[PDB]
């Protein structure tokens, strides 16, 4: 009987959580926009910030030649553009380079919050979250230069992340955690990581 | 470059916005937390059950068998943000009478204050080894031969030494602040989810 009540109260919490996120989005959207314009003026800001971010959340998924592509990353943006603020849109923008084709210099991936999937899950949302789905983002690599190719001897690539959908039965992955890390840690804290790299 | 100067300016805007956001969070959730607490107090052993169900590596690992005996009598846990700076956190443990705590130590309230200067020596340690909080020792009176926090040789490690932590020592090698933040930002807001999970696994 008290479990009933507890259940109802928890629904308001969930409701309040989404409202808070909505306010966050409205509040920080102009700031991120302002910050974006300055950061674009700072050469190699993003590859530096990525490298300085916690190893076990990011760099561990990044190979030397992955880093070579990422050295040409001139912009990183994260948006919460939809009615559900839990949807996250991540944008990578590269300058022309030896690895990517010009048609693939602007890479956008959308992660949608999936109520059905989130309810279905039993795992701790901070440990192994199971809530997001996405569509494949195609990348065309220049000849000889495809880092995501599935052949023997080829280093595992950061860039396979872009093909992730979250639609399989797979509680054993890191792609959703990476998305959340980029959205909720790397992007907001990017200047702090960059600043740390600079001190030595 | 001039660019790095602008970045510093913007960062300050972010920190202000982040504090403003938190104040909104406090006004929005405080009434919900009060209502929830009322209902939790009539669910027997809610808190020790939610604690046991919390991630092992965040809480359980610091709790000894004897610690768990004390925690079995935890009837209320509250977290507040009562100061002008919403980053200050006040954590309240309320126990029923038991064989460990003198009756004058059944209401244990620990205040963590956000330290501006401490935070900016450790700016990139945001979620891995935060170093931003300071606190006052919380005195606990234990019944005779029941002081789990004794520093006698051979004495098993105890969760309850957490209450004496201050964060004013030169010590970047700690778990006490991370425990504070886990309690304030994970255990307390997600307690029901933790309790529910424990109940589906019986
Ligand atoms: Ca997998
Ligand atoms: Ca995978
Ligand atoms: Ca994982
Ligand atoms: Ca220490
Ligand atoms: Ca630690």
Residue numbers in the entry:
A (entry chain B): 20 to 219
B (entry chain A): 19 to 220
The authors write:
Sequence alignment revealed that Vps75 is a member of the evolutionarily conserved nucleosome assembly protein 1/SE translocation (NAP1/SET) superfamily, members of which function as escorts for histone (H3–H4)2 tetramers and H2A–H2B dimers. Two histone chaperones, Vacuolar Protein Sorting 75 (Vps75) and the Anti-Silencing Function 1 protein (Asf1), are involved in the Rtt109-dependent histone H3K9, H3K27, and H3K56 acetylation. In this study, we solved both dimeric and tetrameric structures of Vps75 from a pathogenic fungus, P. carinii (PcVps75), and identified a structural basis for the inability of PcVps75 to interact with PcRtt109. Therefore, we propose that Vps75 regulates the HAT activity of Rtt109 by affecting the interactions between histones and specific histone chaperones rather than by forming a complex with Rtt109.
The PcVps75 tetramer consists of two identical PcVps75 dimers, dimer I: A/B (orange and yellow) and dimer II: C/D (green and dark green). Four quasi-equivalent protomers of PcVps75 are arranged in a solid, walnut-like structure. Two parallel α-helices (αA1/αB1, αC1/αD1) are present on each side of the PcVps75 tetrameric core, which is composed of four domain IIs. Within the core interior, each PcVps75 dimer contributes two domain IIs, including α-helices (α2–α8) and β–sheets (β1–β3), to form a golf ball-like structure. In this area, residues Y80, F177, W180, and L197 on loop LP1A of protomer A form a hydrophobic interface that surrounds the highly conserved residue F191 on loop LP2D from the opposite PcVps75 protomer D. The polyanion clusters binding to Ca2+ in the Vps75 tetramer neutralize the negative electric charge on the concave surfaces of the PcVps75 dimer, making it more convenient to cover two dimeric PcVps75s together in a tetrameric form. In the PcVps75 tetramer, residues E192, D193, E194, and E196 were involved in a calcium-binding cluster that had essential roles in sustaining the PcVps75 tetramer by burying histone-binding surfaces within the structure. The PcVps75 tetramer conceals the major histone-binding surface of PcVps75, which may be a way of preventing non-specific interactions. When tetrameric PcVps75 encounters histones, it can dissociate into two PcVps75 dimers, thereby exposing the histone-binding surfaces to the histone cargo.
